[PDB]
Symmetry: C5
Subunit: 292 residues, 5 copies
Amino acid sequence: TPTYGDERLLREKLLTNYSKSIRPVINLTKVVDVTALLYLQTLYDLDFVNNFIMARYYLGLIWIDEKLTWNPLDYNNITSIYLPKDKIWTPPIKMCNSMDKSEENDGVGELMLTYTGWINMWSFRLLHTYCQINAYTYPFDEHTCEIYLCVALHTINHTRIKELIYEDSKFTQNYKWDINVSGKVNGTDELFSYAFAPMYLRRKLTVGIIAMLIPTVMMTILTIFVFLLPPESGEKVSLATTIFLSNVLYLVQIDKTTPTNTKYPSLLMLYLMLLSMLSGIATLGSVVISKL
Amino acid sequence: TPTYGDERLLREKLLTNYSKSIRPVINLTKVVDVTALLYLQTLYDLDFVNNFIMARYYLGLIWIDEKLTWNPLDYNNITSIYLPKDKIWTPPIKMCNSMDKSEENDGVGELMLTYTGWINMWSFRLLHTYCQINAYTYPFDEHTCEIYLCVALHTINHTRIKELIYEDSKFTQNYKWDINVSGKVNGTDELFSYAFAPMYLRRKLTVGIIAMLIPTVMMTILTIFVFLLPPESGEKVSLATTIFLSNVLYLVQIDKTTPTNTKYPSLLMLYLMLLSMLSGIATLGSVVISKL
Amino acid sequence: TPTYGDERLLREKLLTNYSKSIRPVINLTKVVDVTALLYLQTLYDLDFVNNFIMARYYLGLIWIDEKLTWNPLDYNNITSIYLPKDKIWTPPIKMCNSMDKSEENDGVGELMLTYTGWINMWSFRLLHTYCQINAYTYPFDEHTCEIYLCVALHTINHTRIKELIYEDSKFTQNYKWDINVSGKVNGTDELFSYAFAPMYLRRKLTVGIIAMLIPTVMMTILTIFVFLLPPESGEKVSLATTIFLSNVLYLVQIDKTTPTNTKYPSLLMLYLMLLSMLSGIATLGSVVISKL
Amino acid sequence: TPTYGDERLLREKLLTNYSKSIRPVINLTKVVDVTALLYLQTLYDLDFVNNFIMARYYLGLIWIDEKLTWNPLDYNNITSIYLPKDKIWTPPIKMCNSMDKSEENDGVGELMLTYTGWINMWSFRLLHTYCQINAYTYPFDEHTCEIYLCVALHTINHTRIKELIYEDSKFTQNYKWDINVSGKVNGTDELFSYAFAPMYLRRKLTVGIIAMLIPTVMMTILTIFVFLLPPESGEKVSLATTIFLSNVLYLVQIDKTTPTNTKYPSLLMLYLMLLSMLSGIATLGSVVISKL
Amino acid sequence: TPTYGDERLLREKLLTNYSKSIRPVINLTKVVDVTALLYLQTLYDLDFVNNFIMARYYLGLIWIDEKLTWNPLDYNNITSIYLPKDKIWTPPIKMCNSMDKSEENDGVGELMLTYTGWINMWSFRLLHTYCQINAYTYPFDEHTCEIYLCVALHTINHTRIKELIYEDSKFTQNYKWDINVSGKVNGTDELFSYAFAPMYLRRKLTVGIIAMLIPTVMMTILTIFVFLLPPESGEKVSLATTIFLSNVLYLVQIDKTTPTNTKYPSLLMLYLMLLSMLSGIATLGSVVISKL
Ligand SMILES: *[C@@H]1O[C@H](CO)[C@@H](O)[C@H](O)[C@H]1NC(C)=O
Ligand SMILES: *[C@@H]1O[C@H](CO)[C@@H](O)[C@H](O)[C@H]1NC(C)=O
Ligand SMILES: *[C@@H]1O[C@H](CO)[C@@H](O)[C@H](O)[C@H]1NC(C)=O
Ligand SMILES: *[C@@H]1O[C@H](CO)[C@@H](O)[C@H](O)[C@H]1NC(C)=O
Ligand SMILES: *[C@@H]1O[C@H](CO)[C@@H](O)[C@H](O)[C@H]1NC(C)=O
Ligand SMILES: *[C@@H]1O[C@H](CO)[C@@H](O)[C@H](O)[C@H]1NC(C)=O
Ligand SMILES: *[C@@H]1O[C@H](CO)[C@@H](O)[C@H](O)[C@H]1NC(C)=O
Ligand SMILES: *[C@@H]1O[C@H](CO)[C@@H](O)[C@H](O)[C@H]1NC(C)=O
Ligand SMILES: *[C@@H]1O[C@H](CO)[C@@H](O)[C@H](O)[C@H]1NC(C)=O
Ligand SMILES: *[C@@H]1O[C@H](CO)[C@@H](O)[C@H](O)[C@H]1NC(C)=O
Ligand SMILES: *[C@@H]1O[C@H](CO)[C@@H](O)[C@H](O)[C@H]1NC(C)=O
Ligand SMILES: *[C@@H]1O[C@H](CO)[C@@H](O)[C@H](O)[C@H]1NC(C)=O
Ligand SMILES: *[C@@H]1O[C@H](CO)[C@@H](O)[C@H](O)[C@H]1NC(C)=O
Ligand SMILES: *[C@@H]1O[C@H](CO)[C@@H](O)[C@H](O)[C@H]1NC(C)=O
Ligand SMILES: *[C@@H]1O[C@H](CO)[C@@H](O)[C@H](O)[C@H]1NC(C)=O
Ligand SMILES: *[C@@H]1O[C@H](CO)[C@@H](O)[C@H](O)[C@H]1NC(C)=O
Ligand SMILES: *[C@@H]1O[C@H](CO)[C@@H](O)[C@H](O)[C@H]1NC(C)=O
Ligand SMILES: *[C@@H]1O[C@H](CO)[C@@H](O)[C@H](O)[C@H]1NC(C)=O
Ligand SMILES: *[C@@H]1O[C@H](CO)[C@@H](O)[C@H](O)[C@H]1NC(C)=O
Ligand SMILES: *[C@@H]1O[C@H](CO)[C@@H](O)[C@H](O)[C@H]1NC(C)=O
Ligand SMILES: *[C@@H]1O[C@H](CO)[C@@H](O)[C@H](O)[C@H]1NC(C)=O
Ligand SMILES: *[C@@H]1O[C@H](CO)[C@@H](O)[C@H](O)[C@H]1NC(C)=O
Ligand SMILES: *[C@@H]1O[C@H](CO)[C@@H](O)[C@H](O)[C@H]1NC(C)=O
Ligand SMILES: *[C@@H]1O[C@H](CO)[C@@H](O)[C@H](O)[C@H]1NC(C)=O
Ligand SMILES: *[C@@H]1O[C@H](CO)[C@@H](O)[C@H](O)[C@H]1NC(C)=O
Ligand SMILES: *[C@@H]1O[C@H](CO)[C@@H](O)[C@H](O)[C@H]1NC(C)=O
Ligand SMILES: *[C@@H]1O[C@H](CO)[C@@H](O)[C@H](O)[C@H]1NC(C)=O
Ligand SMILES: *[C@@H]1O[C@H](CO)[C@@H](O)[C@H](O)[C@H]1NC(C)=O
Ligand SMILES: *[C@@H]1O[C@H](CO)[C@@H](O)[C@H](O)[C@H]1NC(C)=O
Ligand SMILES: *[C@@H]1O[C@H](CO)[C@@H](O)[C@H](O)[C@H]1NC(C)=O
Ligand SMILES: c1ccc2c(c1)[nH]c1cnccc12
Ligand SMILES: c1ccc2c(c1)[nH]c1cnccc12
Ligand SMILES: c1ccc2c(c1)[nH]c1cnccc12
Ligand SMILES: c1ccc2c(c1)[nH]c1cnccc12
Ligand SMILES: c1ccc2c(c1)[nH]c1cnccc12
């Protein structure tokens, strides 16, 4: 059976002439094909004001090393070892479109290496990644966030992202967003290889949200009613003033929470702007009638 | 008696052929059984809006090293030494479901090693760990937060979490949450070993909270009274308007503080939505009667 | 006179067989007695909502090393040297009850060593330390915050906190809190040595605070006056509504700022809750009289 | 074809007598001309209250090394290698006018070196850079933000910024700001070389913004109307009070969001101050007429 | 002319027997006189609530090394070299009264050394430094902030701060604060040398501020007018209630923004407290007259 001394001998011979900074290819003219595996774990939040999405992923990177190989029968059937991540060449993949707010560094850890040269380098990653969030169809709104991977400095004739396999682990259920992160895409070659996973996010219709909407609907009905009220009823000016006040309160409230960076504005927000304008027109009619 | 030179000799012989990256087993076919001890210290806060719980734990890790052994009679009865945490193999346990906001790194410290090979590696850990917080039964609400431990990259045929012993140290009393973190659970094997401690949190009924509720109750009584008030009393429209205003003020207030990510909405919030709807219906009746 | 070469020779002989990880005692059966000196510098703030106190201290640690000694007459009267903090054994003292938000690491610096073995290791430390803040007697409120020191992993038969000498440096005057941090306490032995300094904090009565109170007092007088107002005066309902509004505005305001984690609620807050209830009862009487 | 052993030999000979701290020039009397390439990627936000702009750039640095050269025919046509960034001399360029909030250190990475000595050192950089933000012509406002580069400590007779080439990558479209970052500028020599890229930012006129203004315009019309209303209409005092309230609500609202550090105040804010003053004058006229 | 090999030889001989931790003096009885140069660059903000001032300085430190000298004619006229900051002894100067929020560590960089032994160690530093901010004379308020330098652990017989030369670089104009940071001061010897630069800050009177004041003045005039209004006018109670509401709105607003830690409270705040008290007295008179 394999022993501690056997693995020690294997590692000692394995790392004899290894340069961490020289790409791991016998012939330097060939590229190293990296296939990345980005399994989402949890979608913590979707910050509308800052245009970010906070999530934790299980970024995986797989490639082939041609210098790190061995006949396992020559080492008592040792088929795999674990190496410190900072002793071996690692492709310079970065979360190109993201602020990596991770708590561990990307050079402290361990990777799994197989006797054929295949390296697995699973790594956890908490990302604050930029998304262009359009709150147009709120609250029945959808969004598309692209999580980018790209090599840092290597050219496509040196290192390439062969493929990007993105899935969802289903660790937790959200109850606020319906996440749809599935599919395979080849890397895009434009001087530096890079790929992106499209994340589709649909807000789930919660009865808390529908209840929060209900006040808006009944205020619209009430505004219509007071606008239809007889000019000589006597309550015109009073209810027009009080409900213009309340309308402006909700307009300020929503406007301070709606994203300011959208391709189009929020339909609901504009519908409440129209409501406030109609309340103002009702007040105008009331004062005009009162003076005349 | 044991001396400084004796411990120096012991350490020098002990670390002679030790590889930090080779698992500590004579035969590599055997697994290293890690038993984790997670004693809670303080529950700083339960952030509802961010769906996190902030606490400080005394994470402990115990396993057995088969290479680090000695006959203590051969070294003047030295029964235990202290080694720097980064010189010895350490299982790659991570707070899988947590943002480790600790201030010290997880590779700077010290561990206690016993002559039989048993290693104790107590470590402090301040965690911002994700919890699905349902504010349904507020303020008589309960919650279940699972604190996850899982090996980072090792397979179950290499490293396993034998057990998880979680308790509460009682360092401090909360006065806001009743914490119930006690029990033992075996590790779960699904390609990577992992376990979780269930933390049950019950909000303690404080008289500050009951006093905060009292205004809501008296506003409900007052709304019922004004709704029952005679249409021809003369105060109908006035009190309906003013109390619809105040109702909406409390509705906005609570809605901006209630969690938006819940399996069900807050019953109290929906009860105040119903109160606001009834106030609106009272205003509708008042205006209808006033015009007719 | 002592020279650079003399100190170089001294250090070279001093560090010859020193192991940073072996406790500094000739006989390992004896404990190392550490006396800690915690001089407060400034009390930046007392955050009520987060239950923390922010301050900057001059944590000092003194112990005796039995391996690091020399006859000063043998080295041209060199009586003390300065060593890098990470080359020498340092007791593993941690701010057990604190989030060390310091900006320098605890392994980068310098310590003063004397020819008798005595080590001084003064270190600055900015702490966010947990305190159970009870806002009961606000604004004439007092608090007790205990700053904890405890060894990280060493047993009481290896390392002990001999004493804790805590004082105040008086660097700055607060004008908001009266600080009383003075006294000496022996360490407490419960498997791991530890001690704590009690910090008493009394809010200083400022005329800004008394002025902030004045509105509350005059609102109480005014509420009493309107409650005593004749039912048939005609201003009853109007002033009851407007002053219930303003009362609720201040009640919401204070409740959003008062700590939610207190042994008892704030007396002033409950007195304003009673004020709001009395305003509601006045409104109830007014509407009842108006209908009848 | 070039091989791993060939590149190993090349690097071994290349780094034989290289001192990272000695400037890379054969004759020390000559300067190293550094040309910097600052390609903007995304303009995350423009924080008005803090006077900062948050963006992510692709800072590039190019210079010539006279010690790191080779005849590529002597090494099987190896024309370029990749070196770790901390093994080679790197010009001490700093984001002089910026808080570098990047997540990777500036001494961990890789650079591209060519057989003629030319070094490319592309590096990602997320910057919180100070800008003097004048909200005068809001919301048709423009701004000029200068991104500064300057050598840290080297004199102009040692290191110089030859040129600064700044462009925009167009990675993402903003929809909130029109960015115009293009042009070439020579470095400025004043004891320490330095250059700056001028960034012009024009707020794009969105229909969400125009809708947000619409309430202000109709309130101005309504204030004019009520000011023109007959003194004896009977609604003067009522609408003057209610609309002074609402005016002050919007004045407080805008004033709490407008930058306090501007060369001139916001015209729109001052126009609404004038609106509030006119409402106050209307109230003055109403009360004066009512008493007389 | 000097060459790369010449500088390599110089550095190799220079660092032969240099100990980074032994003070750089031939005779250890002499002190090292450090003169510090603190040139301010920008005053980002003055945070009133947290009692801090955020600025970026060009902290410089100059002293004399007696071991690092050379005859420049013996090395082809090399008159100065650049050494890595962590290879040479560096005085342990700390921003004693500040939270150093800098992004680079204080042991990564470079210093300029001259053939006579003189070392220049210019370093950038972004500081969050504590200031006792008294908002008494707001908005015509002044402040004095002292930026402290002190040696960390060395005694005055080992290391001293000879002088502190503080100036302003004028990099940017503030438009909000008039900064006056100029002068020279000797170090203060009280067991540990230390000095401080006094920074005087005067708020510049902006027309945005005067316009923001204008509402307060017109509300004072209006309150005087309504208080003078005839008891039997009929608008007394109405305007007293509405303007007590608005007064309390501004009182709450200012009180939540004024610093709570001041030697004396804000005069303007207390003048508005008096305004609110006068409004309350007017309401008291109105209700008393109405009942009687
Ligand atoms: C490693 O390289 C050295 C040259 O530096 C050579 O002598 C040795 O034979 C090589 N060994 C292997 C296993 O490639
Ligand atoms: C490198 O190129 C040569 C050229 O013939 C080829 O024989 C060799 O197989 C290549 N290396 C590998 C690992 O295939
Ligand atoms: C080596 O180990 C593998 C692991 O499954 C096993 O299938 C194989 O039979 C083993 N071979 C020998 C020669 O031990
Ligand atoms: C790879 O591409 C880069 C730029 O695209 C070029 O400079 C380099 O010479 C190329 N290398 C090879 C081996 O083709
Ligand atoms: C996810 O999106 C893709 C592309 O829009 C679609 O084909 C697929 O059906 C979606 N899946 C779910 C579960 O929504
Ligand atoms: C992606 O790459 C594979 C491998 O060369 C190729 O077969 C396939 O056609 C490419 N395109 C897609 C859409 O998979
Ligand atoms: C340690 O390993 C070496 C081989 O590198 C061997 O010569 C030596 O005897 C070993 N010593 C022990 C104590 O195992
Ligand atoms: C390793 O396996 C062999 C196989 O017989 C066994 O004799 C030996 O005891 C095992 N090692 C240990 C430490 O038990
Ligand atoms: C060794 O130390 C242990 C510690 O309790 C003690 O019980 C034992 O008697 C000692 N044995 C010898 C031989 O000193
Ligand atoms: C352990 O499991 C992994 C995957 O489950 C497998 O690749 C590996 O060969 C296994 N090793 C042994 C010794 O069974
Ligand atoms: C804690 O929870 C468990 C399981 O729900 C229960 O058996 C136990 O009684 C609880 N203990 C306390 C103190 O609530
Ligand atoms: C847990 O593991 C132990 C040890 O093998 C076993 O005896 C026990 O049955 C397992 N299950 C539980 C619930 O303890
Ligand atoms: C230090 O220890 C070594 C053994 O490693 C010994 O040969 C030497 O004499 C010791 N020197 C001193 C000064 O203790
Ligand atoms: C250690 O113990 C022995 C036992 O007699 C004693 O003589 C010696 O003095 C002790 N060491 C010290 C430093 O006192
Ligand atoms: C050694 O230095 C101390 C320092 O005060 C002094 O008192 C003493 O006389 C000196 N002794 C000699 C022999 O120099
Ligand atoms: C010290 O105490 C620990 C636990 O309290 C024990 O394991 C250890 O054996 C003790 N050592 C001595 C020398 O008494
Ligand atoms: C500090 O508190 C202690 C204990 O409560 C008391 O004896 C002492 O007089 C206090 N000192 C001051 C200055 O308040
Ligand atoms: C503290 O320790 C000292 C030293 O042994 C002892 O004299 C004293 O009685 C202890 N207790 C107190 C309260 O000081
Ligand atoms: C490098 O410098 C050494 C002197 O330290 C010299 O002997 C050697 O020849 C030099 N080699 C090269 C390639 O410059
Ligand atoms: C350095 O100066 C000498 C002086 O003549 C000159 O010949 C030489 O070419 C210079 N070095 C380089 C790299 O040009
Ligand atoms: C070296 O490589 C370059 C790369 O394009 C090629 O153009 C040139 O012909 C090659 N020369 C030799 C001799 O291989
Ligand atoms: C370069 O300039 C600095 C200051 O401007 C001066 O001290 C130094 O002597 C100059 N060096 C040369 C080689 O001119
Ligand atoms: C950018 O600004 C420059 C200088 O103001 C101007 O010449 C150029 O036309 C501008 N370009 C765009 C696209 O606005
Ligand atoms: C900038 O530097 C270049 C290179 O010396 C020079 O030709 C040019 O005149 C300078 N000025 C401008 C505006 O480009
Ligand atoms: C440096 O110190 C060593 C002793 O460690 C001595 O032999 C050598 O001569 C010294 N060299 C210089 C230049 O001082
Ligand atoms: C050190 O002191 C001696 C005492 O006479 C003196 O001669 C010498 O000059 C001093 N060192 C220096 C660098 O002045
Ligand atoms: C050395 O360089 C300085 C730099 O200005 C110059 O003034 C001096 O003449 C030079 N001397 C020699 C001998 O080269
Ligand atoms: C320097 O002062 C410290 C304390 O002030 C003292 O302990 C030390 O002995 C003094 N050293 C000399 C050389 O005077
Ligand atoms: C700065 O303050 C000092 C001392 O108060 C004063 O002498 C000097 O005139 C002031 N300068 C300015 C520009 O305010
Ligand atoms: C400061 O130190 C210098 C140098 O000794 C001295 O001349 C001066 O009198 C001291 N005081 C002042 C105010 O400069
Ligand atoms: C490194 C990696 C990627 C890039 C780069 C440098 N410069 C760019 C300019 N435009 C687009 C991408 C890049
Ligand atoms: C390492 C450790 C755990 C995991 C991993 C990589 N990839 C996963 C995918 N799904 C679930 C868990 C994991
Ligand atoms: C190290 C240091 C202190 C402790 C520890 C581990 N475990 C504990 C459990 N309960 C209380 C204190 C501790
Ligand atoms: C280093 C680099 C730049 C500077 C410096 C030190 N001191 C300065 C004083 N004023 C302006 C720039 C500088
Ligand atoms: C180091 C540096 C400065 C100080 C110190 C330790 N202890 C103090 C106590 N009081 C004041 C200053 C200090």
